[PDB]
Structures are given as C-alpha cells and as structure tokens.
Symmetry: D2
Subunit: 317 residues, 4 copies
C-alpha cells in the first residue's frame, strides 16, 4: 500500500471540491521537478564530451513551459526574468506562480545540493493580469514548497493543510510519500549563518551567536553547519531543528534573499511545520511587496530558537 504524489494531489483536489485546475498545476510541477532532477544529475553529459561528435537557463525554460502548458497560470515570476511573465489568453488559468528554478546556480561547480523553490498565489484581481497579481503578502499563499536535488531528490509540499515530504524514486519516476504532516522540533541544536560576515553583523546576531557557542547556563554549544544553498540549509533546519539566519549585513537592511521566490515559500513551509519565520521585526509572510525581485532578511527555524533571538533583538532598541 503506497501513496504517490499524483494520487495524493488528486485525493486532496477531490476532498476540496476543486475544479481540477490546481491539480493540473501541481501535476505539471511534479513533471518539471523530475526533468530538472535528471538534468542536475547530469544524465547525458557523455554527449557534450563527444561520445557521438546552461543548467539554470534550461531549468528556467522547463518550468515556464511545463506550467504554461498546464492551462492553469496567468502570471509567472522568475529569478532570471526581469519582468513578470504574462501567459497568453489561450493558456490562461487563474494561478500566479513565483519560483526560483535553480537555487544556488553558483554552487553546481562544487556539486553542492541545489534546489527549486515555488509559491502559488491565486489571482485575486479580475482585470487583465500583470505584476500586481504577484505582489501579494505570503500569508496569501495557497501552496508552496521546494525540491531539493542532493544525495537523493525530495519534494516538500506545504499547503493550508500541512507539510508532506515526498522522495523521488528515479527508477519509475514517482514521488513516494515518505514523511507526512511534518512538524519541526520546538528547539534544535544547530545554528546556520555565514560567519565570515561577522564584522558586518548587527548586535543582536552577535549576542545570539555568542550565546550559542558559549552558553551562559553552560549546557552544550550549538553545532554550526552552512552549506550555502538555501534549500539544503532550510531542509536540514526542518528535519533536524535549529535556526537558519540570512540577516542584514551591509547589503543594506534589504538582505540578500528575495521575498517572493525564496523567503516567502520557505517561511510558509516553516510556519505550517509549526516553526517561525521573521525579519527580526515583522513575520516574513506579512510584508506587502513593492517589487517582485525585492529582497528581505530572514531568520527561521525551531519555535524557541527563533523566539530567543527575537527577545535579543528587542533588547537593542
């Protein structure tokens, strides 16, 4: 007795009395994540090396094409694409999708785990679609999640109902349900941040990190891990607990990570996994975007760990 993503998605579209438009959207997203996984594992490199005589771009076009053909999307927002992509009236459906096709293109050389991030907003506005229908607070996400292409490939889908983890079996190309209604730990034991920007940190970070390497109560210190690929670091934070920080160094208070297609999906997953996600001031999901490519700081993780750092931010006011 086994549940595949295809079965699960359909079971949930039927329980929700959906017209089946979102189920086609999600089915297309499954197919594209498998085509991206195959290309990331380098199936076919023999042919470039002349056995018979770019990845982020190819991933981009695969996602845009497979979702345009689902007849379920009107507005798409991409990492690469400068402007929002408006789908032809012939293929329009009502969802808005914001995605990062290949998190950490800078990391493929060294074969670091890379991933795909996505958030689906339902178009709310009636009139002719545009950038505006994407500019919605993350609290308004219908579904979001990520595909991690690491040791194995995993899809994490979070919707209004919960977080569920699917493992790709590459022999038959099916995502099998492995972990269901995932909830993160209350407090973890690992902290993730790029410490080489230590000089540029704000004082609440400095204090937090010091408490984690030399606890005052004098328990154990927290282990550090920083892969430097946002899907790998957040995935480990979800599975194992802890806190992942990508705070405001002197790339202004904007932070580095983008709001619509990196911070917001991850935050929605955290919050459905019963964790927290914040700028340090506001919850990430409540920011109303000014721009699609807008950046935002983020700290996310196990409930207590995030709370502890918010209290320290509070003392430097």
């Amino acid at each position: 007795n086994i549940v595949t993503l295809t079965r699960f998605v359909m079971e949930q579209g039927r329980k929700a009395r959906g017209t089946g438009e979102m189920t086609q959207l999600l089915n297309s997203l499954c197919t594209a994540v498998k085509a991206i996984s195959t290309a990331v594992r380098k199936a076919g490199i023999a042919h470039l090396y002349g056995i018979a005589g770019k990845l982020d771009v190819l991933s981009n076009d695969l996602v845009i094409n497979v979702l345009k053909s689902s007849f379920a999307t009107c507005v798409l927002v991409t990492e690469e694409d400068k402007n929002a992509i408006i789908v032809e009236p012939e293929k329009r459906g009502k969802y808005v999708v914001c995605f990062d096709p290949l998190d950490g293109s800078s990391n493929i050389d060294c074969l670091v785990s890379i991933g795909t991030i996505f958030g689906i907003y339902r178009k709310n506005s009636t009139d002719e679609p545009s950038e505006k229908d994407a500019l919605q607070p993350g609290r308004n996400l219908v579904a979001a999640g990520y595909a991690l292409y690491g040791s194995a490939t995993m899809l994490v889908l979070a919707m209004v109902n919960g977080v569920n983890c699917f493992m790709l079996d590459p022999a038959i190309g099916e995502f099998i349900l492995v972990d269901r209604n995932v909830k993160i730990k209350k407090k973890g034991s690992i902290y993730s941040i790029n410490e080489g920007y230590a000089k540029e940190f704000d004082p609440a970070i400095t204090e937090y990190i010091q408490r984690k390497k030399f606890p005052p109560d004098n328990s154990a210190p927290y282990g550090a891990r920083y892969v430097g690929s946002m899907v790998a670091d957040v995935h480990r934070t979800l599975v194992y607990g802890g806190i992942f920080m990508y705070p405001a160094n002197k790339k202004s208070p904007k932070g580095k990570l983008r709001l619509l297609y990196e911070c917001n999906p991850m935050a929605y997953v955290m919050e459905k996994a019963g964790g927290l996600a914040t700028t340090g001031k506001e919850a990430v999901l409540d920011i109303v975007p000014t721009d699609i490519h807008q950046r935002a700081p983020i700290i996310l993780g196990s409930p207590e760990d995030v709370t502890e750092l918010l209290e320290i931010y509070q003392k430097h006011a």
Copy 2:
C-alpha cells in the same frame, strides 16, 4: 576524443607495465561506486513502501564483495568493521584497501551530500595478510580518491601522476573525464570548520579564524562554509580553493577523523593537487599508524592558507 574511467585506467596500466591486477582493482572500485550512487539516489524505494506487496551496511557489503571479486586484494579495512578483513586465499591479490563506505551516513535524512573514501596500499610484507599490512604511512599509497554523491556523482582519483575528476553519466553508467590533472589555487577564499566548538579551540586556530573575519589590513573576510560531510567540504576545497580544518578540540584531543580511511586519502589528494595537509604539527602522510581506526587532526587546503595557519601555530610554541 571522449575518455571514460575505463579507458583512462587501462591506458595508465599499459604505460606503467602493470600485470593488470591493479586495473582490475580500479575497475571493481568503479563498479562499486556506481552501485552505491544508485542506492544513495534511492532507486527502488517504492518497494520499501509496499508497491507490490541501513544504506551504509548495504554500502559496506557492496564495496567488500566487489573488491574481493577483483582477485586483487588481501586486507580491507573498513570504517564499519572493528577488525581488518583478511581475504579468502582463493581471491587473494597483493593490495590492501582502506575505505569509508559512506562518509557521514547521518547526512542521508537531511539529504546532505555523502561520499565514499578509499586508499590503496600495496602489501610490502612477505608475511601472511594481516592488520599490520594496513598500518603503513599514507606516504605509501599507490592510489587514493573519493566519490561524492552530490547534485551529481563525481569520483576524483589521485594517483602517482596526478588528480583527475570523472563525472558519472547515469544514463549509460560511465564516468567521463571532466577534469584533467587538477591543481588547487595557491590562495583560497573560504574557510571550513565547525565553529560551534569555538569554546574548545586552541589559540592558533582561534587566531586564524579571527584573522579571516577581521583581515589585518582592509581586506575582505573569507566566506565561511561547512557542509558537514568531509567529502563535500574537501571537494569544494579542491575545486574552489581555501582551507578545511578539523582540529583536535578537547572532546577528541587526537582529532575525530580517522587516519587510514578519511585523513590519508584526502591528504594524498590535496598533495597531488598541489595543496597541503597537516595536523598543525606534522605532515599527515608521514604519521606511522599504530591502530587501524586511529584518529588524526587535519588541516588541508591551498598552500598559502595552510601556511598562514602553520606560522600562527609556530608563533605559539
């Protein structure tokens, strides 16, 4: 002309006038890594989840059996096996293999990169195969390398003449030569160590890290990265340049990484790469093993960066 692992290892055996036994051993090694890689990528899990009705144990078993089958080995030293495995007299050859089947088996859940590490020695004794044949300085390695199962699968093989990186094309099951006689950068740009243990670091490590975050001139700090699996961190270090450190803290005054099957291969690879690998005190490859599961400290990376840490070491003697 495309070069495949199988072609390269043959050509190299021809040039060295070897009787083929070693090429058999490398051939076998190749078949084992492809088998680990498929199992790691989770081909066939659907069966586990009842579609029709640990991995490290499986990995250990794969490596042991394929290697006994080359008729090229007599002693195998395994991470997972307390004592050295003495090969059956019928399948005995003159090589001694030390391997770590799955560098960091605990990184599977988190879907963090994992890897296999190996070192090959030639038995130099007349005496029957015994644990003693394994206790040879890493300066006696005939071949060493590793396979990283990351976003893609790559095997780096370091031999007498150099370091070449072969990527697996999983469609035809062939490793293609992608990088030929790799040389690591003089000076890197990233440092790698678990800073949670900052409570227990010796003053030289402490001074070096400080120097990377607050560079004594006006310089840009180094990026920090620590994935948490030796093969992923050492491979990013070989490819991108920088330094990787696992010093001895007090909870492991002799280090934590094992000398015969983690340290010496990685040290042999760095040295053939044109980088350095030390314990802070001596060179890793010159340490004479006493125990097959002996731990050693290791600092390895680009020559300049490793030398800054050594002058810092000597400055506190």
Copy 3:
C-alpha cells in the same frame, strides 16, 4: 506542446465530468506499467547475481496492489489467479479490471517483447461484488489498452473517443503523447499467424493464406511476420496495417487466447482504431462470457483484410 499521460487523463476526466475515480484508476495503471517496465528491463539484476552478497508473479502483484490502492476497483480478474480478486470493502470503487500482467511470459528467456493487456468495466449490479460482474461483453468496456515493453515502452489507451499512444521517457518517468487518435490502414500487406499448425487449419484459413502467398490478381505477395507475443503482433498490426490471426484448430477448438483479458481489450483497440475483430463467426466484442478464463478465436486488423477472410469463411458454409 507536451502532453503527458497525467495531463491527458486529467483533462479527459474534466471533459467527461467524472468524479475523478476513473482518473485515479488510470493514474494507477500508469504507475503500474512503469514499475513493470523497470522490472522487465532488468534494473537491479546485479543484486540477484550477488553484487552485495519470477517476473510474471511480481507483475501480477504490482498490478493488484497498485489497483487496490486507487480505491477505484471492486473486482479484479488476472490471467494468473484462478478466481476473481474481490477488493476489500474499504477500498472498493465501481470498476472491474480484467488484465493480463505479462502477455507471453515464455518470451522472457528468448527476450522478445512482452506486454500488459487490460480492460475496464463499470460494475452496474447492486449485488455484493463477485466473479459475475466481470462476465460482461467487450462492448461494455469503459477503456482498454496495453503497454508494450519492446525496443521502447509504449502505452496505448482506447476509450470511446479514440486510440492514443504514449511513449515512455524512462529518463523522467513520464509517458508522452506521440500519436493522437490512431486509425489503422484500410488494407495492409502483412499477415500474422503461426503456420506450424497448418495441418490443423480450417479451409477458410487455408484458402486465405494461399491467396496471400500466391495472389489471385497479379499483386505482390504479403510479407509474413509472427513474433509470438500478442501485444507485439497486434501493435505491429495497429501501426503498420495488416491482419493478425489466432483461429481455432484440432488442439484448441475454442482458440488459445482468452476472451476477458487478451481478446476483448485488443478488439476494443482495433474497432476504435477503425479495424475489425472477429471469431470468424461473431464480432468478438458481443460474445457474452460464461467463464472468466474462457477462450475465443480472434482475427483482427485492417477492415479490408479481415473482410476478405470473412467472405472466404462465408463461401464455406
């Protein structure tokens, strides 16, 4: 624009305004065929050969567990199980599925093409499900088709609206629509029959074959082909045109092929594709079954070929 079988099934479902029970069944057929294709192809035989220290049965068990897990079936008839499988109440749906898991099981050693054949009926009686709900004439089929595991794997599905062919891309585990709304050639140039039984043919089969080898008007003879796999031979007939015959004789006065799970599916594919299917006396599809393992004589293919044989049969009565 790419149409995957997942997209296709789902769209057709929306237009037929089904409650999605059929789409779930049809999605489970698809997953079942992929798992069986991977097994036919010997992915993993190395493990049977000790790298780490019955296909028919297993395919039987993959079709039953996956069909049961769709909650869309109530009675299943297998070639392999002497009785109808009655789905347990909590998984019962409204469809009856008649299947042959691996047509031509004896072809696995010689390695010729084998396939999976299926037919779907709707249970329409209110009595507690029984073997009886499967005894419906082929004319009552909701959907029928096959999966051919040949040089490539292809799934052919036929429903009331036509026949469509899906090629498996094994690199992503998705079936792609390659031929849409297939019609068979009007007159073919290849006949298929096992001529070793020439001794036992009735005179109409004997006259038809003579007329194919020595054509009455001065045409070139027909080519001859007979693979020995019903799915391979009927698929060649569908795409290339011609006639496939497995009539009755001294042995097998009722024919060899079984009505519920080999004859009727292929006969529904042929009539939907514009070809004929006959016993020599009735159209196969109108034969009301008396037993689940009942046999029938079958002749199918291009309408002008099948007719020329029915005429010869009539001129011998």
Copy 4:
C-alpha cells in the same frame, strides 16, 4: 562473485597475454552498446516533444567515434557507409571492425526488437589500410557478437573459446555474466523464415517447410516464429534451438543479408555455440569476400535441423 563484462574481457586479455589493445577495443564496444541502448529506449524524448531548454545515424556515429577513440582500429565497415572508414593516422590500431549499427531500423516505428551486430578481424596485410583488410573470410574473425535491445538488453560475445551472454543492468550501466559457454540444442522445434516469399522459394526450402508442418513420421509439427529482425530471430534460435533461414529466392540468387556484418558475425556465434551456418552449398565462414557490401544466403541453427535441410539440398542437385 559476479563477473561484469569489464572484469571478463580484462581477465581473458590477461590470460591471452595481449598488449591491452583488444581489451581497449572490447571495452569501447561495450560503451557504444550502452549508449545505443539508452537512445533506443527513448530516454530524452520529452525534449523532442517540446519540454523546452535518424536513430540509425546516431547509432552509426556513436559506434564510429567510440571505436575511433580506443586507438585500436584502422578500417571500419558500416551498413550505413558506402565506403570503408579509414581511421586517421594517430588513432590507428590493428583491428578491422565490421558492424551493423542498428539491425532492422524499420522495426523502430513498430517497436520491435532491434540490435547491433559486430565482427572483429586483425589487419593482416602490411599496406596502408584499405577496404581490402575487411575482405577476409569469416573463419578469420578474432571475435564477433551482437547486442539485442529486446525486453532487456543483452550482449552476446563469441571468441575463440566460447559464446557468453551478458545481461545489461541499466541501473548501474554494467553488463553481468548470466550464461556462460553457451551451446545450442542439437535439434530445436521452431523454424524461422518469411513465408510470404513462398512463390519464390527453391524446392529444397519448399520441401523443408512442408516436412516441418506435416511431419512424415507423424511426430509434432514445428512451431513457426519470424520477428523480422535478424538479432531477435537468431538470438531466439541460440537460446531455444531451431533453425533460422533467409535463403536465395529472387533478391538475386544471393539473399538479402550481407556477409561481413550480418551473416559472418552470426554464423561465427552459431559455430562457437555448436550449431551450423551454411548458404545451402558452402559454410558461410569460408566465403572469401569480394565487395564489402556483399550479400549472402544463410541458414543457421541446431546441427540436426540444418543437416536435415542440407540432405534435401543434396537430394535436388
């Protein structure tokens, strides 16, 4: 222990005491065969169907470029090439390879079994290489064999000492030894020929078939099978026993099949397997070639069945 094709070719190379050049040839051939198998099974067709980002040709390109890259060949003759390919000076080795890259490419649309056939001669003349080095009788072949891309992929290799069969495990891309020192059944019970050419057969074939359908001792008739791909029909004949015939009829008094790359490799396999291969008059392997594209009649299979038919050819001279 398992024996992979790579371990076998190497140990037989070590025993024959060769310079490693022919092992480099056989290893290269094994790599082109996997590359052809992946392409044939249509891995990657979604890209042709627009997911964003003639087989005959590619099979020919893969074989030529992979065989060139082993630096072990000097003349190659292909089904697809009008003239013998002379290898460039710096890649010249001493072997002559005659190959049929994709036996029966017309089976592709219909998805029927296809294969690749090869025979290897040693250049024996002293002149700068020419098609002349290919015009040697099949009795001079060093090695010959075929790969069949059927329900699974199998390579069959015949060398001085026997016929061995390797199944492709496509999960690891490794050929595993499954049946060693194959000998064919003395008498089989299947005959194989295209009987649509009955108005063209000579009287010995005509009588031969009559006797197989109407056995004069009233024993059982033989079963007929004809797939239409030489590799499938001939492989079935090796495995299950019987006779395969494609004689002269009117496609010249010389037959359809070609001597260097279809007839000689298969006849060689049959003789090392213990069967026979004749044209009706002489043995196929003693025909001295005149053109590289020369055709030949061929009859092959179980010794007793071929002899029976030779006695009928004798009764009509």
